[PDB]
């Protein structure tokens, strides 16, 4: 954030984030000469990339989505087309845009609150009445569909434990609570999402019954 008049002369993203104060604190904000960090969230105002910028801690505590198409075509794509072309021809632009094309077809994500009360078939994604995990046409193949995804729960369990005990060694103590919300540590907010991945993947396997009793 440099001198304020050159950034008066033309609208930028970081200047817009800095000059927009917060409701919590109009006494801690970027000044002249420092660096402003931001990420770009997804919206439908395509004329302006200065209308989609947000503080990293604010998108942390308020959980706004990310514009994967912005990061795909505006951040990544053109440096790669600088580097990868001179070794080959223009079939190399088509090779990386086709290596995108085999891999672009896999995406993951008022009225939106009135959902749930049923879940889609784990095999073929068909919404249906009742809580059972398998579909009646894909009911036979179920031992393989249980086998699949318990090796995913197994790998999320292994990632929870390596992270939440690293904070205990970076903190010093093994007997008291961790309080470190250090925004420059990758440890923070990577220890926050595995709790939710595990929360979700544990509940998907309770679609299947229990492997035994527990009150004996």
């Amino acid at each position: 954030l440099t001198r304020a008049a050159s950034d008066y002369a033309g609208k930028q993203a970081h200047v817009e984030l800095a000059e927009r104060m917060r409701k919590r604190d109009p006494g801690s904000a970027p000044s002249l000469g420092d660096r402003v960090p931001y990420v770009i969230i997804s919206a439908a105002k395509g004329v302006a990339a200065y209308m989609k910028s947000e503080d990293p801690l604010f998108v942390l505590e308020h959980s706004l989505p990310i514009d994967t198409q912005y990061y795909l075509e505006q951040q990544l794509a053109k440096p790669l087309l600088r580097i990868f072309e001179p070794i080959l021809g223009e079939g190399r632009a088509e090779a990386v845009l086709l290596r995108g094309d085999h891999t672009r077809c896999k995406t993951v994500l008022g009225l939106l609150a009135f959902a749930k009360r049923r879940n889609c078939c784990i095999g073929c994604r068909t919404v249906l009445s009742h809580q059972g995990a398998v579909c009646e046409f894909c009911q036979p193949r179920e031992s393989e569909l249980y086998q699949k995804e318990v090796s995913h729960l197994n790998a999320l369990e292994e990632r929870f434990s390596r992270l939440w005990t690293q904070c205990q060694r970076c903190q010093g103590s093994l007997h008291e609570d961790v309080i470190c919300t250090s925004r420059d540590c990758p440890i923070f907010y990577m220890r926050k999402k595995v709790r939710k991945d595990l929360e979700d993947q544990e509940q998907l396997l309770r679609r299947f019954g229990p492997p035994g009793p527990e009150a004996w």
Binding site: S31, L32, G33, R35, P37, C170, I179, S182, D184
Partner: protein, 105 residues
């Protein structure tokens, strides 16, 4: 850059933040970020102080670690030895290497 100054006659001031911001071109200039880059590492505090005395002892150990880190950075980065050699080769005082540019020399 726009800074305040406070007057002390006889004594010399060396904020390590200004030395980093003048010499080095980095990505973040927080104490955590430069302590990781060189070495390798408000509302909660108000209830660690309105509590008991072992909480206040924990607060004091945290504050003493904070007050110790810039000494280690000053002696490890060879700051002061290079400032003394710069003042001996150029012939300007030791307060001008934190306030001025490359014209007075």
């Amino acid at each position: 850059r726009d800074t305040k100054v406070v007057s002390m006659v006889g004594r010399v001031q060396m904020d390590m933040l200004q030395v980093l911001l003048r010499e080095y071109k980095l990505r973040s200039y927080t104490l955590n970020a430069v302590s990781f880059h060189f070495l390798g590492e408000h509302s909660i505090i108000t209830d660690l102080q309105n509590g008991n005395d072992q909480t206040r002892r924990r607060l004091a150990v945290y504050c003493l670690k904070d007050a110790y880190l810039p000494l280690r950075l000053l002696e490890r980065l060879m700051v002061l030895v290079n400032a003394v050699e710069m003042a001996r080769v150029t012939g300007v005082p030791l307060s001008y290497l934190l306030s001025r540019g490359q014209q007075v020399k």
